[PDB]
Amino acid sequence: EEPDREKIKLLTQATSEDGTSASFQIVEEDHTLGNALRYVIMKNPDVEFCGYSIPHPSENLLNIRIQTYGETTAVDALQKGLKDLMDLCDVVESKFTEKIKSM
Amino acid sequence: EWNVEKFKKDFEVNISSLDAREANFDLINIDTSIANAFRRIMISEVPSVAAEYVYFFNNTSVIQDEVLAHRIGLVPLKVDPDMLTWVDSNLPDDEKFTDENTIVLSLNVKCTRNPDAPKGSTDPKELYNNAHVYARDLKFEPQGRQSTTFADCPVVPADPDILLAKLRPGQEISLKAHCILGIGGDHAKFSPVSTASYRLLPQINILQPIKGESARRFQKCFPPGVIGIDEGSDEAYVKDARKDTVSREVLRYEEFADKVKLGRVRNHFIFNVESAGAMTPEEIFFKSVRILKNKAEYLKNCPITQ
Amino acid sequence: MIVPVRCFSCGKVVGDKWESYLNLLQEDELDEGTALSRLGLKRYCCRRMILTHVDLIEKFLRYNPLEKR
Amino acid sequence: RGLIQDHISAGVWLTSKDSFFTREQYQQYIYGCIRPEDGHTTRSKIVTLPPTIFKPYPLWTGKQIITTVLLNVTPPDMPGINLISKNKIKNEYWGKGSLENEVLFKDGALL
Amino acid sequence: NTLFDDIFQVSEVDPGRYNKVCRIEAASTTQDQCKLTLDINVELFPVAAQDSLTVTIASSLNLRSWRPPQAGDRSLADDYDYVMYGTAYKFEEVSKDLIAVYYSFGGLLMRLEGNYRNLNNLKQENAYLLIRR
Ligand SMILES: [Zn+2]
């Protein structure tokens, strides 16, 4: 129920104050979400740099760093990623259902 | 410029074959990260229902208790995993297992001898009684609610013929397995698919045409039906590049390795999802894509912490 | 020990296909290859699972100490 | 103390003039190898180079990747290391006119 | 601005041992002392012997950062087909006048040979290489 306070964390060591460079750490994730999320994030024209890195397979951790220019915030750019992934997966599900029905 | 609607314009699905146990379908115009996301999730993250806690009361068989417990874990059950929620761990064993989160399977087999077969070994099944312990001997034991809920979906192993153990007269197996909801990532017994894999569509770029008996001689180098020749006096054509296996056998011959290129279609993905019976493979794919979406909703909803 | 439930490499349940496979090598006088083709073990990870199996339990079971001999 | 087996053959493959990488791939390899949150840098942000090929498509070399990592691990207050070394691979193997045994480092950039 | 511009006739196309790079040997049609040796990705920019390439070296694409294209603006690359950004790393003298300049575009090397024209091609931290076809 509570807003998960430990899923995503903003690594102060890796975040600008002006507003366009952060490293986020998500627990219990890997390439599964990571590579898709960075892929959609790279579609954002305002992302300069984005990528994900696993500190260690055994640790079950995912760090994803987004540094942009002054035309977007890294939190905003990430939300743009997640809205794109949700809507895109809606597209996949919708066409898959349609072709399942067409048979 | 890129938008999600230009993807929806560009994304395609083509379903070649939909069996109640296998689905072979294509995802055209997608990113490898997404096809691999669906594959990875279909394998590790899609929940399935499998035996987890086997409680033995007696095992006189020549098979090790632990081993038999693992084997009972491996048996896939024909259970719609949505009939049950997850079992927590923060709480005592008395609260862990309820009729909302656990399925009970009893196994009570006692091996005997039969009154005198014909010759002797006349196998095992005639010399002995209940000599073969199968997964079909896992009797489903409901509790209350789920007793009614399964009135029209009783619990059965998705393959009753699985041999679980072999006994001898006087040997006996009595155990009670607690089947829970789990994901294939935490242990491979919870993976609902046997094989969920993708392969890029092979592309056979013929750089210069081949004809006559060199064209048919090229045709026999590939799987029977990949390369078609209609006349061969003018071309040696590709009936279907999807039939090919990329054995790259054609490159063994200079007749071709300088007049053909073998590539792939980065956008076109050929998925093959075969189910272990717990669920139909397409329904498993639906759960995988709805799982990725649910994960993106979880990340939208979460507050960025610091 | 006993025919594995699943093929280590792939994941397809195979433990149900042992006795019929052995019947197909005896009763139908088939060959191991064709028997595995009719069993649906169309991958070598599966092919090898049953093809190479050594059901040593039959040798173990004759040592059952719970019956007179 | 140095890298071994696979890391050596990987460096041989990555550093070939034949290895190109898209912006996505390049940046991914970079954050894959550099974590500023881990104190892996002297910048507290990330910096990047122009692509090797501006044309049809923006393309980075593997040598540009080694340039980016060296540009990111060395302190910004210092000029790039300048070195003329050699390889264990004769130039003849890369072609009749190829020149690949001279290892050239100019101001932090493998050229 | 531009530093050197010419139409080159390709005299050799050697793929070496590579699948998408080739070392091209070309000579200028317009000056007997202008020579070129450049490694190009023929997979992006296919080339053949005896073919007409319009090589231009410029100091910038102008008509600290890099941006993907935007259809709101164009550069000198809008005029040419193949663009590389590289650095000059060696200046060798072939005569009391002949001088050969060396650029590296992340390891895609170029060797221009000349004698006097170089003087608009002095060493710089960057050189844009533009090719037309
Ligand atoms: Zn297998």
XYZ file of C-alpha atoms in Angstrom, chain B residues 41-277:
237
model
C 9.676 -12.961 -18.558
C 7.851 -15.921 -20.084
C 10.682 -18.030 -18.710
C 11.556 -16.715 -15.257
C 8.868 -14.285 -14.085
C 5.558 -15.824 -15.203
C 4.151 -17.507 -12.069
C 3.235 -21.177 -12.100
C 2.000 -23.672 -9.515
C 4.325 -26.480 -8.451
C 4.855 -28.709 -5.444
C 7.019 -26.952 -2.883
C 6.857 -28.610 0.554
C 6.718 -32.415 0.574
C 5.910 -33.862 4.009
C 6.952 -37.507 4.213
C 5.431 -39.810 6.794
C 7.188 -42.952 5.548
C 9.560 -43.885 2.734
C 10.944 -47.428 2.702
C 11.785 -47.272 -1.008
C 15.303 -47.575 -2.411
C 14.961 -43.951 -3.542
C 16.255 -41.107 -1.416
C 13.592 -38.999 0.289
C 15.157 -35.720 -0.863
C 15.436 -36.972 -4.442
C 11.818 -38.112 -4.547
C 10.778 -34.746 -3.117
C 12.626 -32.924 -5.890
C 11.030 -35.203 -8.469
C 7.574 -34.478 -7.086
C 8.496 -30.810 -7.336
C 9.311 -31.251 -11.013
C 5.863 -32.653 -11.900
C 3.933 -29.889 -13.707
C 0.353 -29.583 -12.458
C -2.553 -28.672 -14.740
C -3.618 -25.771 -12.528
C -4.644 -22.316 -13.618
C -2.145 -20.388 -11.451
C -4.641 -17.540 -10.992
C -6.758 -19.664 -8.635
C -4.185 -18.892 -5.916
C -2.329 -15.943 -4.442
C 1.236 -15.926 -3.163
C 2.170 -17.298 0.247
C 4.146 -14.832 2.325
C 7.025 -15.710 4.680
C 6.754 -12.931 7.318
C 4.263 -15.096 9.185
C 4.070 -18.443 11.001
C 3.612 -21.791 9.278
C 0.078 -22.003 10.672
C -0.876 -18.937 8.638
C 1.347 -19.687 5.639
C -0.805 -22.480 4.197
C -4.482 -21.745 3.640
C -7.017 -22.835 1.052
C -6.378 -19.540 -0.749
C -2.638 -20.059 -1.229
C -1.866 -23.797 -1.041
C -2.919 -26.985 -2.812
C -2.554 -30.302 -0.996
C -1.679 -33.516 -2.833
C -1.592 -36.814 -0.963
C 0.370 -39.877 -2.015
C -0.168 -43.176 -0.171
C 1.133 -46.212 -2.058
C 1.942 -49.630 -0.607
C 3.665 -52.158 -2.837
C 2.605 -55.799 -2.671
C 3.200 -59.004 -4.595
C 0.688 -60.399 -6.860
C -0.741 -63.903 -6.466
C 1.614 -65.607 -8.855
C 2.085 -64.298 -12.381
C 2.841 -66.648 -15.297
C 6.570 -67.291 -15.662
C 8.487 -64.888 -13.439
C 9.602 -61.380 -14.370
C 6.558 -61.284 -16.628
C 7.533 -57.668 -16.226
C 7.052 -55.900 -12.880
C 3.480 -54.773 -13.256
C 2.110 -58.340 -13.115
C 4.546 -59.836 -10.598
C 3.925 -56.900 -8.253
C 1.027 -54.639 -7.315
C 1.518 -50.874 -7.477
C 5.112 -51.571 -8.449
C 5.125 -48.376 -10.534
C 4.425 -45.089 -8.746
C 3.285 -42.463 -11.268
C 2.365 -38.803 -10.973
C -1.199 -39.945 -11.681
C -1.188 -41.344 -8.118
C -1.016 -37.806 -6.658
C -4.521 -37.609 -5.212
C -5.794 -34.032 -4.987
C -7.009 -33.088 -1.504
C -9.061 -29.861 -1.494
C -10.076 -27.748 1.494
C -13.467 -26.107 1.734
C -13.643 -23.143 -0.633
C -11.188 -24.490 -3.204
C -13.024 -27.811 -2.926
C -15.977 -26.019 -4.521
C -13.813 -23.788 -6.720
C -12.198 -26.835 -8.343
C -15.523 -28.670 -8.796
C -14.956 -28.077 -12.517
C -11.154 -27.791 -12.459
C -9.849 -30.600 -10.249
C -6.106 -30.776 -9.693
C -4.326 -33.236 -11.990
C -0.699 -33.597 -13.007
C -0.329 -32.224 -16.516
C 1.293 -35.583 -17.368
C -0.049 -38.455 -15.257
C 2.204 -40.957 -17.024
C 5.363 -39.587 -15.389
C 6.980 -42.415 -13.476
C 7.821 -41.021 -10.044
C 9.207 -44.032 -8.186
C 9.458 -47.805 -8.403
C 8.765 -49.946 -5.340
C 9.035 -53.558 -4.184
C 6.722 -55.588 -1.924
C 6.590 -54.157 1.584
C 8.045 -50.834 0.476
C 5.712 -47.895 0.971
C 5.484 -44.177 0.218
C 3.286 -41.834 2.254
C 3.790 -38.110 1.738
C 1.718 -34.938 1.514
C 2.928 -32.291 -0.925
C 2.109 -28.602 -0.522
C 1.938 -27.000 -3.968
C 2.302 -23.220 -3.951
C 2.420 -20.379 -6.479
C 5.945 -19.547 -7.632
C 7.936 -18.042 -10.493
C 10.369 -19.813 -12.806
C 13.115 -17.391 -11.818
C 13.210 -18.426 -8.170
C 13.391 -22.060 -9.250
C 13.102 -23.754 -12.616
C 10.214 -25.909 -11.402
C 7.978 -22.824 -11.495
C 8.739 -22.026 -15.141
C 5.459 -22.635 -17.011
C 7.091 -23.043 -20.443
C 9.260 -25.878 -21.706
C 10.944 -23.693 -24.330
C 10.207 -20.043 -25.113
C 12.709 -18.920 -27.730
C 12.997 -16.479 -30.603
C 14.957 -16.656 -33.834
C 15.534 -13.854 -36.310
C 14.034 -14.451 -39.722
C 16.811 -15.787 -41.973
C 17.343 -13.669 -45.074
C 18.967 -15.200 -48.144
C 20.229 -12.389 -50.364
C 21.112 -13.882 -53.741
C 23.751 -11.568 -55.173
C 23.722 -13.029 -58.687
C 21.205 -15.477 -60.148
C 21.910 -19.177 -60.576
C 20.120 -21.420 -63.019
C 19.688 -24.886 -64.474
C 21.376 -27.731 -62.651
C 23.568 -25.360 -60.689
C 20.360 -23.681 -59.506
C 18.783 -26.983 -58.453
C 22.156 -28.080 -57.105
C 22.088 -24.951 -54.968
C 18.479 -25.779 -54.094
C 19.415 -29.114 -52.549
C 21.944 -27.416 -50.231
C 19.096 -25.954 -48.149
C 16.213 -27.492 -46.195
C 13.668 -29.011 -48.564
C 11.438 -26.104 -49.515
C 13.519 -23.070 -48.615
C 14.871 -22.568 -52.142
C 12.324 -23.089 -54.918
C 12.959 -23.220 -58.650
C 9.986 -22.683 -60.945
C 11.835 -22.983 -64.265
C 15.462 -22.364 -63.347
C 16.193 -21.059 -66.852
C 15.785 -17.542 -65.415
C 16.097 -17.773 -61.635
C 16.523 -20.001 -58.621
C 14.114 -18.531 -56.086
C 13.399 -18.817 -52.367
C 10.080 -20.503 -51.613
C 10.272 -19.512 -47.934
C 13.299 -18.209 -46.054
C 11.521 -19.085 -42.801
C 12.103 -22.806 -43.375
C 15.865 -22.402 -43.196
C 18.002 -23.428 -40.230
C 21.146 -21.403 -41.034
C 23.262 -24.536 -41.282
C 25.431 -22.398 -43.602
C 26.155 -25.585 -45.566
C 25.992 -23.642 -48.838
C 29.217 -21.877 -47.972
C 31.114 -25.166 -48.288
C 30.956 -24.731 -52.093
C 32.639 -22.048 -54.188
C 29.742 -22.430 -56.625
C 27.843 -20.240 -54.184
C 29.900 -18.666 -51.394
C 30.692 -15.830 -53.828
C 27.144 -15.503 -55.235
C 25.107 -15.550 -52.008
C 24.866 -13.601 -48.747
C 23.214 -15.000 -45.608
C 21.754 -12.507 -43.141
C 18.752 -11.956 -40.874
C 15.897 -9.487 -40.415
C 16.667 -7.601 -37.200
C 13.058 -6.437 -36.890
C 11.362 -9.770 -37.570
C 11.294 -12.231 -34.675
C 10.021 -15.796 -34.863
C 8.785 -16.769 -31.405
C 8.236 -20.403 -30.455
C 6.550 -20.933 -27.080
C 5.798 -24.492 -25.987
C 3.828 -24.956 -22.770
C 4.297 -27.652 -20.149
C 0.494 -27.981 -19.933
